[PDB]
Symmetry: D2
Subunit: 123 residues, 4 copies
């Protein structure tokens, strides 16, 4: 749900995710990673599927962060695809793809894959 | 580096991707898939890293589509992560993750992964 | 290490993995899944990289299970790629790809991706 | 269904895959990669699901290579998961995971993912 997704979230690495879900299915916010060639905050944009189902199904969503800001440019972007499960203890379970810009010759090693789980902080 | 990302691209499945890249790293547009529980257009939003590096490398980017519009709601979202290469034949080579909303029980099989290559041809 | 990998392992879904690591870098065993179009045990084969590094690095390894046995044929195969971390509490952290056989038309939806963590049981 | 899997295949990077499929679902052979911290041949072992279904579908299979041999040890392993399609032009379309051994600290970036397509040409 938008209200349920809106908030500050942290993942197992200690990275911060601040987001707002709009009525139109949009997601906008900032991301701060605890690891990598990153520093300070980066802008994120994504979408969620606003009308999930009733049932105890998660809401699918995804978002992107290009790792460039006024302090660093890592020439890479990460996308997170996963689901939001609300409740007392709401979580966002995801899998992600991190692509670095390479020459055609090294494209075979441009993408990393992983999974992150986010926990919402009160408020 | 960045540049002719803006345009209409098509992938090997015949899907259509119409995007606009903004000068600060934003990507906006619509997507129409040739396959799946989808029909007509969907909104997409993403980001790309400009200021790519100056050893002829690609420009990294990614975007998302939630499969809900005024015709269908498939309860899923797809994210594409990859890089753009311009030149005579410009290409956007990606790997995607498609997550459908499931119950906890079926969460082990909620995510499909694949790769798509887009051209303006 | 071979001895360290050899044993019975279980993952978060409640699936069983029984394996033997040979001196040559080989892995052979049976797998029993708690979920899916599977029943009873299936044969598994894989390899590990026998001479890791010293250090507190994991040992990379991977294995495959084709989901066909005398009771069921699901026409699919799964491969697990990950690392073995030994110690008192040894774990095998992996990511996997599950491919189903399809027509060329539905090949875009043939592969599922996920991650599993295995815990070794004593002995 | 199963059948001409046995043979020498090559992928878009020019790597060579020489395999033997056994009648009960086993795959054995050697692999030589054209890229990476690798040289000469490596042992591979896998499985395929025969008895594929009778709606012209592919045969699922997968295999593993640990990148250690008498020349180099790169402390990594790769697994390829995909399906074989025979016919005039036989193909093995896969998606792979390459995991390198890291310390817990670097475990978030231990795994690369990609796709390879093999032909006997
Ligand atoms: O190093 C880079 O290229 C940019 C930083 C990448 C940080 C990654 S993105 C996925 C994973 N989740 C996090 O919170 N951090 C790492
Ligand atoms: O069925 C659904 O869940 C909605 C449609 C999904 C279409 C997918 S997304 C990845 C692949 N590339 C495309 O252009 N379409 C399919
Ligand atoms: O349904 C099938 O096609 C065969 C069973 C698949 C079970 C999968 S493999 C990855 C994940 N890990 C498990 O232990 N079980 C599921
Ligand atoms: O550098 C390493 O870690 C060992 C060599 C890895 C070669 C990879 S595996 C996937 C891709 N396909 C190939 O044929 N070679 C590369």
């Amino acid at each position: 749900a938008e209200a349920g997704i809106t908030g500050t979230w942290y993942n197992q690495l200690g990275s911060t995710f601040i987001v707002t879900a709009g009525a139109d299915g949009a997601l906008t916010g900032t991301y701060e990673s605890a690891v990598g060639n990153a520093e300070s905050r980066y802008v994120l944009t994504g979408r969620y599927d606003s009308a999930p189902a009733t049932d105890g199904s998660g809401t699918a969503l995804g978002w992107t962060v290009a790792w460039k800001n006024n302090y660093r440019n890592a020439h890479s972007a990460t996308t997170w695809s996963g689901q939001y499960v609300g409740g007392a203890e709401a979580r966002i379970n995801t899998q992600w793809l991190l692509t670095s810009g390479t020459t055609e010759a090294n494209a075979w090693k441009s993408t990393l894959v992983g999974h992150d789980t986010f926990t919402k902080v009160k408020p």
